Amino acid sequence: GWQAFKNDATEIIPELGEYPEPPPELENNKTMNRAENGGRPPHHPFETKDVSEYSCRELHFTRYVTDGPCRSAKPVTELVCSGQCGPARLLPNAIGRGKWWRPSGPDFRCIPDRYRAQRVQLLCPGGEAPRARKVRLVASCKCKRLTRFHNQSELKDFGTEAARPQKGRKPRPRARSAKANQAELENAY
Numbered sequence: 001g002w003q004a005f006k007n008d009a010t011e012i013i014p015e016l017g018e019y020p021e022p023p024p025e026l027e028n029n030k031t032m033n034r035a036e037n038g039g040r041p042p043h044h045p046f047e048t049k050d051v052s053e054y055s056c057r058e059l060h061f062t063r064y065v066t067d068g069p070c071r072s073a074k075p076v077t078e079l080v081c082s083g084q085c086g087p088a089r090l091l092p093n094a095i096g097r098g099k100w101w102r103p104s105g106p107d108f109r110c111i112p113d114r115y116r117a118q119r120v121q122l123l124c125p126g127g128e129a130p131r132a133r134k135v136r137l138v139a140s141c142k143c144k145r146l147t148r149f150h151n152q153s154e155l156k157d158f159g160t161e162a163a164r165p166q167k168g169r170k171p172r173p174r175a176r177s178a179k180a181n182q183a184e185l186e187n188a189y
Contacts, residue, residue: 054085054143055083055085055110055142055143056081056082056083056084056085056110056141056142056143057082057083058079058080058081058140058141059079059080059081059082060077060078060079060080061077061078061079061080062075062076062077062078063075063076063078064076065120065122065133065135066122067122067131067133068122068124068131069124069125069128070122070123070124070128070129070130070131071122071123071124072120072121072122072123072133073121073122073123074120074121076118076120076135076137077118077137078135078137078138079116079137079138079139079140079141080138081110081112081138081141082110083110083143084108085108085110085143085145086108086145087106087108087145088145103149105147106147107145107146107147107148108145109143109144109145109146110141110142110143110144111141111142111143111144112138112141113138113139113140113141113142114139114140115136115137115138115139116136116137116138116139117134117135117136117137118134118135118137119132119133119134119135120132120133120134120135
């Protein structure tokens with residue numbers, strides 16, 4: 001006996017189904033805003049003081065004086081002497097072409113004037129008492145030219161010093177003499 005089999009063809013026609021189509025995935029944002037500024041500084045005109053009188057001008061200064069544990073309740077006025085003037089040139093004839101002799105050393109200076117002694121009132125804290133303080137400050141001042149004629153001068157000061165030895169010997173003055181002399185006195189007939 002024998003044993004056989006029976007088969008047929010074979011067709012492969014699958015339908016499948018792999019169509020993955022998911023939704024999107026992104027983002028989109030915007031931006032918008034506003035701000036404000038500020039700037040309103042002060043504004044004023046310009047100015048300037050000018051002074052140039054004759055003679056030596058008077059410099060008025062102010063400062064607070066203090067002496068001890070107390071202090072001046074108010075400032076003090078001080079007068080300083082300063083300024084500039086001319087050589088004051090004015091002759092009855094006024095000449096000068098190409099001949100001179102006198103010195104050509106012009107100078108300028110102002111002379112002092114009456115002074116003024118002011119009294120300040122110093123106050124102390126809770127514990128001490130106030131105290132007065134007098135201050136001698138110039139009251140006036142005038143500008144008077146003056147020609148000097150000084151000379152000579154001295155400045156600086158730098159010197160030195162050196163010391164050296166000193167040896168030696170005295171001389172040797174030698175000399176020997178001899179007193180000798182002949183003489184004849186043999187007379188005859």
